[PDB]
Design a protein around this ligand. Structure first.
Ligand SMILES: [Mg+2]
Ligand SMILES: [Mg+2]
Ligand SMILES: [Mg+2]
Lengths: 45, 282, 125, 410, 121, 99, 94
RNA sequence: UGACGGAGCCAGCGAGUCUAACCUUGGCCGAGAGGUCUUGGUAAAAACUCCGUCGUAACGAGGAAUUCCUAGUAAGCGCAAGUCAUCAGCUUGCGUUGAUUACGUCCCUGCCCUUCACAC
RNA sequence: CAUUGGUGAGCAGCGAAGGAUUUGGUGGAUUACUAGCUAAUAGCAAUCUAUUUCAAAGAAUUCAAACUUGGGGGAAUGCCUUGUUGA
């Protein structure tokens, strides 16, 4: 893992970089399960 | 620079891996050459290899210093920076100066608050060829590491029976000619590796009448380092110690700069194996 | 989407992130007003950008600075660099480039470290 | 390689130990040291002209060296690189010192002031930044991305506006007065800026030839089709001679070969620009050739310090009255060449030293400029030499105090 | 190969050819002369084209994607933008393949890691 | 060896290498006739045999003494070496030798 | 040539080699291109190349590069030794 | 250029189911082994900023000589780890604050080197 | 407490017989404007073709004609070259 970090290319681009998000700490954020519209919430309420 | 250094290492590592695979192929070509010259029959595995025989026509016209040093061996003089550990004592600073005088092209650098990655990265920018870092214990030198740039090797030594020149009265100033070098009792492949590392800290082509000699004598893996000044007399040679005296014992050799704790270890000292004291590796 | 820009300031291990958006002249550092930055003796240091270009330029923007690492002094320098860079970048992105050139000229004339990072790289001699 | 123009011999050739291609060059003003840089080594080689030996290899750059330049007076060396930094080397002297200056982006070109006190650099962001060498601080900046005219290529799938192919200047040079910069790049514009005010004096279109590729910002939509641009279709097979039909193009080549090898249209670009040492003109190496722009025609009416009383008629009246100094000064205030020439040749030899001693210091650069241009092609060799002798003797000290104002005229 | 094996002319020229091809990147190794025959292929040359090197540097997920980014003016070698996907990159020049400064791709890389500095752009 | 160049070098090296390999290498593996269609190879064998018969008859009607050849094998005439015929047709017809 | 064109002339230079070139004395105008002008009128060989003062043709005579010639008869004995010693140094350097 | 107290506040290294006292006074259970409780003694971020209080035998900042030192350097401050040699009477890392003076000269003292144009 | 996360409910302000977003088709430009057709020194433009044919000129022993082939090895039968046999 330390080696993978060292040889990382800063210019690597993946289309998925749009969907994935990173935390202020710099660590990747993974959703627990993978918002509700007002119409959906109204039915559930 | 960073991208260039990265790929140069990957290409170099790839070359080593291929050469190990190609070592078998090289032996096979040697057998064919001997068979053709001697006229003796070729062995069965080689007799049935049509691809090898076809290749042999091109490979017939095929024909030392270590690869890290082969490029500059004897062309460019070394550039050496001698430093110490953080907050060095007064004696270690004196010893670092003594090591600086030992190598003609050495420059002493104060290590105040310098971090290791910056030190090597700064050294690589400036064209430094070797880096020497010294450690102590209560003002007694204990260790000496030598890192060769840009990609190693890094060799760590432990110093014993150190006698500095400042411990002498009215010793005087050293001579700083390019010194003659003596490497005695270095027989194994590891010894040849150690010799190559130490040989290239000095400039190439000392004058035949140079009056300063530095000797590294191997005695049971304890390399005695002495510095003498000689005068050729009518019935022999008379030498005088200049110092310092100290014995280094290798205990590690890594394929990389001293910053890289993850570098592959080329050789290490096993002290707890059962037959440790039986054999001397160097 | 509200127009916004993001910039960084660095000094030794201290890192400041400045977010500059359209607003009403609300300048905060670490969730508190800039006037509470410490040490007080160096407070005017973090005021260097604002006083050089004038408070009128900030009246239409909100700046939020988050600072981590380093000590007090390096954190002050990170804050001032981040604020200056953020103001210049916002003027590039959402205001004319003439005003940007004036801002760069002012900051460079006073102190170039506001815009360009000051790192004391070792130099073997 | 060093060339001697007296005998046209390659009297010396300098080469690196490790076989490095050289892309930039610099020469000592004393003509004793030569430095070259490369795009694959990151070091600067230095040789001794008299000996031909490699003196040393300057290190410190973390990127390829893009450009070099010696300063004429203080004799320092300024180098730039794609390393986003500029380093000033004090190679001469007992101590070796390097002063790095950081820049926001990759440095592509570098020019040194005739005074040697400032250095300008063109970056990849399209900026010309001027730095003070002694103090190593920025003193000015010129933004150039908007000025540059870059055209859409026939093969491009993206607009010229969004194109970032060349919105920077790859070559810059100062005027010898020290007040102007001429810049060019891989684009269709040569921009002339005024350094003290950081403004664009004028912009010049390099070419209007549609045979060159980068000329037009917008391309005719009629050429575009479902297949693509009609221009991109190769019609070599139509040619009647076999030599024309033959295709010798290498699949991927960009430069360094004959035009047949490229298979793409020539692109308008300026490789180098310089000011004339002896005239108000500059030369730009481009694809079509060396464009030379000069102010020689001077049809412009550019008066200096006129008043109502100054007139071409009043100038002739002054000559008739034998007021030669007043006639000459009034000619310069109008700044008319035909009037200056008329007055210049009407001054008798006896009174030239009297006039020369009394010319105002403000008009001294103008008379010296007129003599230099007039004398080179005139037949009055002795008359012009008499004037020069009188002017140098009278105002020799003033010209010395201002070397860079009088440099081209001298 | 048909020149005698100990010929200095033969050994010199074969090494020069091996040196030049390895530098271009067409040849992975310089050890064996038989590689000039066995390992010199069109695939070796195509493997040095700009799209393929972008793919191996992980700048693009596929060679087809790399070709599109080149054709769309996102790629620069040195300070020069290149929209030709046949550009052959030598070993030394592979260090200067990178994104164009104002590229939307470059902003996505920095935005993903929360390292975008709008001063640069 | 240092002087010899050209085709003579390539053919000489191959001739030497085959000789050494014959001792230990299996007969099927060491020598392999290059793949040729039947109607070509049968034609090549027929014409070569005709040349040999003409060569032998001309020597027989004259007094010329010729080197001895084993029964199955083809005689190695000058055309054998120049045309590299053996790599295609072979030293002999193996099918007839086997029976 | 083909490989250089393919690599856009980013090749590695060939190893340096030395060769010998013969220069024929000629007027400098001849070397120039053909038009109604000339740049330089000097000769193509320098005065040193036309004639360089060398070793004395006569055995008795001593001739130096500065142009000073001395006959051994006139030289005093101290000078003869001094010149002999100077000869030893020059040969030793070479 | 102090001591005490309070308040505000700023780092970077470091993650093996592995990390860690000693000597006693007594109760109970237990065939024993031992288990549990009770008991006394011994050992074992800082700088920085602000506010308030007091107040200016041996040794009081170290002789002669001698050594080292040029920028994130000298010096101050703390926090970690202990990586097959060395180290705990300590060693090595990491961050924080951060200058004065020179960057010239061969005068002295040592070491060293020398005796293809044009122009000289 | 912060969202420069989504989805909604409403104000202040802007605000002339409504406003916003997207999209198909066509026209003019994207180089610097001397008109259509033909058998063209003139006809036609509603075409003639019921004068549209004759005459004159016009044929290199160049009687040469792959500058056009991925590398190595061959080529039975083809093809090219050279000689040869009988008509
Ligand atoms: Mg210290
Ligand atoms: Mg400490
Ligand atoms: Mg220590």
């Amino acid at each position: 893992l330390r080696e993978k970090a060292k040889e990382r290319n800063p210019d690597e681009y993946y289309h998925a970089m749009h969907s994935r998000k990173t935390d202020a700490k710099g660590l990747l954020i993974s959703s627990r399960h993978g918002s509700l519209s007002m119409d959906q919430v109204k039915l559930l309420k | 620079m960073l991208r260039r250094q990265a790929r140069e290492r990957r290409e170099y590592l790839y070359r080593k891996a291929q050469e190990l695979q190609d070592s078998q192929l090289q032996q096979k070509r040697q057998i064919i050459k001997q068979a053709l010259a001697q006229g003796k029959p070729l062995p069965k595995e080689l007799a049935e290899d049509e691809s090898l025989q076809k290749d042999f026509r091109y490979d017939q016209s095929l024909k030392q210093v270590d690869d890290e040093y082969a490029a500059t061996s004897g062309i460019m003089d070394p550039r050496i920076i001698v430093t110490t550990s953080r907050d060095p004592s007064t004696r270690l600073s004196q010893f670092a100066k003594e090591i600086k005088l030992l190598f003609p092209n050495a420059v002493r650098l104060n290590r105040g608050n310098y971090v290791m990655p910056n030190l090597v990265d700064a050294c690589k920018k400036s064209g430094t060829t070797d880096l020497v870092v010294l450690h102590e214990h209560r003002g007694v030198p204990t260790s000496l590491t030598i890192s060769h740039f840009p990609h190693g090797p890094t060799a760590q030594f432990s110093l014993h029976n150190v006698v500095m020149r400042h411990d002498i009265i009215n010793a005087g100033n050293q001579s700083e000619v390019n010194p003659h070098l003596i490497f005695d009792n270095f027989t194994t492949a590891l010894g040849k590796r150690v010799v190559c590392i130490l040989k290239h800290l000095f400039n190439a082509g000392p004058k035949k009448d140079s009056e300063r000699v530095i000797t590294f004598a191997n005695r049971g893996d304890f390399i005695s380092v002495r510095q003498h000044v000689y005068v050729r007399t009518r019935e022999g040679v008379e030498i005088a110690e200049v110092g310092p005296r100290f014995e280094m014992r290798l205990f590690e050799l890594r394929l990389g700069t001293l910053e890289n704790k993850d570098a592959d270890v080329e050789w290490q000292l096993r002290r707890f194996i059962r037959t440790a004291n039986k054999k001397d590796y160097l | 989407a509200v127009p916004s820009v993001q910039t960084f300031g660095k000094k030794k291990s201290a890192t400041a992130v400045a977010h500059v958006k359209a607003g009403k002249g609300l300048i905060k550092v670490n969730g508190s007003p800039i006037t509470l930055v410490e040490p007080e003796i160096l407070r005017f240091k973090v005021y260097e950008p604002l006083l050089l270009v004038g408070l009128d330029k900030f009246s239409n923007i909100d700046i939020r600075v988050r600072v981590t690492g380093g000590g007090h002094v390096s954190q002050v320098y990170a804050i001032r660099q981040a604020i200056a860079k953020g103001l210049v970048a916002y003027h590039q992105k959402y205001v004319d480039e003439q005003s940007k050139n004036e801002l760069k000229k002012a900051f460079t004339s006073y102190d170039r470290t506001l815009l360009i990072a000051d790192s004391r790289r070792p130099e073997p001699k | 390689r060093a060339w001697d123009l007296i005998r046209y011999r390659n009297f010396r050739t300098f080469t690196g130990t490790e076989r490095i291609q050289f892309n930039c060059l610099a020469v000592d003003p004393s003509g004793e040291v030569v430095c070259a840089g490369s795009l694959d080594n990151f070091d600067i080689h230095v040789w001794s002209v008299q000996t031909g030996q490699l003196l040393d290899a300057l290190s410190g750059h973390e990127g390829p060296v893009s450009c070099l330049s010696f300063s004429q007076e203080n004799s320092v060396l300024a180098s730039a690189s794609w390393d986003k930094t500029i380093r000033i080397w004090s190679i001469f002297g007992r101590s070796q010192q390097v002063e790095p200056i950081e820049v926001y982006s990759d440095v592509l070109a570098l020019s040194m002031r005739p005074d040697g006190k400032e250095v300008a650099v063109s970056t990849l962001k399209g900026q010309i930044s001027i730095f003070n060498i002694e103090d190593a601080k920025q003193v000015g900046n010129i933004d150039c991305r908007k000025d540059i005219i870059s055209g859409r290529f026939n093969q491009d799938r993206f607009t010229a506006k969004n194109s970032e192919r060349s919105k920077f200047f790859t070559t810059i040079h100062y005027s010898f007065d020290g007040m102007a910069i001429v810049a060019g790049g891989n684009n269709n514009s040569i921009c002339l800026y005024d350094v003290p005010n950081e403004v664009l004096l004028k912009r010049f279109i390099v070419s209007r030839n549609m045979a060159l590729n980068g000329t037009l910002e917008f391309l005719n939509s009629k050429k575009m089709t479902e297949a693509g641009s009609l221009d991109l279709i190769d019609d070599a097979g139509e040619n009647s001679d076999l030599e024309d039909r033959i295709d010798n193009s290498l699949p991927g080549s960009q430069r360094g070969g004959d035009l047949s090898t490229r298979k793409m249209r020539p692109e308008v670009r300026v490789t180098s620009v310089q000011f004339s040492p002896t005239a108000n003109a500059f030369a730009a190496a481009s694809t079509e050739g060396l464009l030379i722009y000069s102010t020689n025609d001077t049809i412009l009416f550019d008066p200096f310090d006129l008043d109502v009383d100054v007139t071409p008629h009043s100038t002739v009246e002054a000559l008739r009255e034998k007021q030669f100094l007043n006639a000459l000064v009034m000619a310069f205030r109008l700044n008319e060449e035909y009037l200056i020439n008329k007055v210049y040749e009407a001054i008798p030899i006896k009174e030239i030293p009297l006039v020369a001693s009394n010319i105002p210091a403000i008009y001294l650069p103008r008379i010296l400029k007129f003599i230099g241009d007039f004398a080179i092609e005139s037949q009055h060799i002795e008359f012009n030499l008499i004037w020069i002798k009188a002017l140098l003797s009278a105002s020799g000290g003033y010209i010395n105090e201002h070397k860079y104002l009088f440099s081209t005229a001298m | 190969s048909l020149l005698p094996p100990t010929d200095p002319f033969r050994r010199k020229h074969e090494q020069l050819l091996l040196d030049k091809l390895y530098a271009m990147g067409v040849l992975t190794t310089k050890s064996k002369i038989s590689d000039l025959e066995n390992k010199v292929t069109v695939s070796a040359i195509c493997r040095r084209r700009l799209p393929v090197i972008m793919h191996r540097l992980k700048m693009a997920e596929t060679i087809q994607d790399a070709v599109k980014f080149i054709e769309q003016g996102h790629v620069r070698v040195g300070p020069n933008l290149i929209n030709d996907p046949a550009y052959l990159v030598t070993r030394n020049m592979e260090d200067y393949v990178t994104w164009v400064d104002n590229s939307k791709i470059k902003k996505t890389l920095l935005r993903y890691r929360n390292q975008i500095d709008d001063f640069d752009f | 060896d240092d002087q010899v160049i050209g085709k003579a070098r390539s053919r000489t090296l191959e001739m030497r290498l085959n000789r050494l390999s014959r001792v230990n290498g299996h007969q099927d593996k060491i020598n392999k006739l290059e793949k040729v269609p039947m109607h070509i190879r049968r034609g090549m064998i027929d014409k070569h045999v005709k040349r040999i018969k003409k060569y032998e008859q001309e020597a027989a009607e004259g007094g010329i003494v010729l080197s001895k050849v084993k029964k199955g094998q083809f005689r190695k005439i000058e055309s054998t070496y120049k045309k590299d015929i053996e790599r295609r047709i072979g030293g002999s017809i193996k099918a007839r030798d086997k029976e | 040539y083909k490989l250089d064109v393919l690599s856009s002339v980013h090749f590695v230079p060939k190893p340096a080699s030395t060769s010998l070139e013969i220069r024929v004395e000629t007027p400098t105008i001849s070397m120039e291109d053909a038009q109604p002008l000339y740049m330089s009128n000097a000769s193509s060989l320098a005065p040193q190349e036309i004639y360089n003062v060398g070793k004395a043709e006569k055995d008795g005579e001593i001739r130096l590069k500065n142009g000073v010639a001395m006959s051994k008869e006139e030289l005093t004995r101290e000078d003869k030794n001094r010149l002999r010693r100077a000869l030893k140094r020059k040969r030793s350097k070479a």
